[PDB]
Amino acid sequence: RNLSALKRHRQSLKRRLRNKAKKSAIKTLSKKAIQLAQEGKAEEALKIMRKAESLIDKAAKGSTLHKNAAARRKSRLMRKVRQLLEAAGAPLIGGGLSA
C-alpha cells in the first residue's frame, strides 16, 4: 500500500544509535579531563584530552558531528583544561598542547 523506501527511516535508526553511541562516549570522556584538570592531576588529564581530541575528529570524518563543531568543542576544551591547570598543576605533558 506504500513506498518501501521506509528503509530510509529504518536506516536512520542505525545511524541514530551508531552516531548517538559515539556521542555519549565523547562527553563522558570529556567529563573526565575537566574534573582531573581541576584536581591538579595534569598527567592523567592530558591523557584524556588527547583521547578526547581523537574521539571527536574520528566521528567528524563520518556524518555525526561536522564542521567547526569539533573545533568549537576542542577549542573551549583545551581553552579550559589548561585554564584550570594554571592552579599549579605543572604541564605534565604538552601531550595535547602546543605550549
What is the spatial distance between Cα 52 and Cα 44, in angstroms, rounded to a whole number? Answer: 12
* DSSP assignments along 40-81, one per residue: T-HHHHHHHHHHHHHHHHHHHTTTSS-HHHHHHHHHHHHHHH
Q: Out of 38, 41, 43, 50, name the contact with RNA by CB under 7 A.
A: 50
> Pattern 3-42, binding to RNA, x per CB under 7 A?
xxxxxxxxxxxxxx-xxx----------------------
CB of 39 to RNA, least distance (A): 19
Of the candidates 72, 7, 81, 77, the residue with the CA atom closest to the CA atom of residue 41 = 81
Q: Out of 35, 39, 44, 62, name the contact with RNA by CB under 7 A.
A: 62
Q: Out of 24, 68, 86, 90, name the contact with RNA by CB under 7 A.
A: 68
What is the spatial distance between Cα 97 and Cα 8, in angstroms, rounded to a whole number? Answer: 42
Q: Which is nearer to RNA, 39 or 63 (CB)?
A: 63
Position of cell 594554571? 86
Q: Which residue ranges make up the site for RNA (CB under 7 A)?
A: 1-16, 18-20, 50, 53-54, 56-58, 60-64, 66-72, 74-79, 82, 93-99
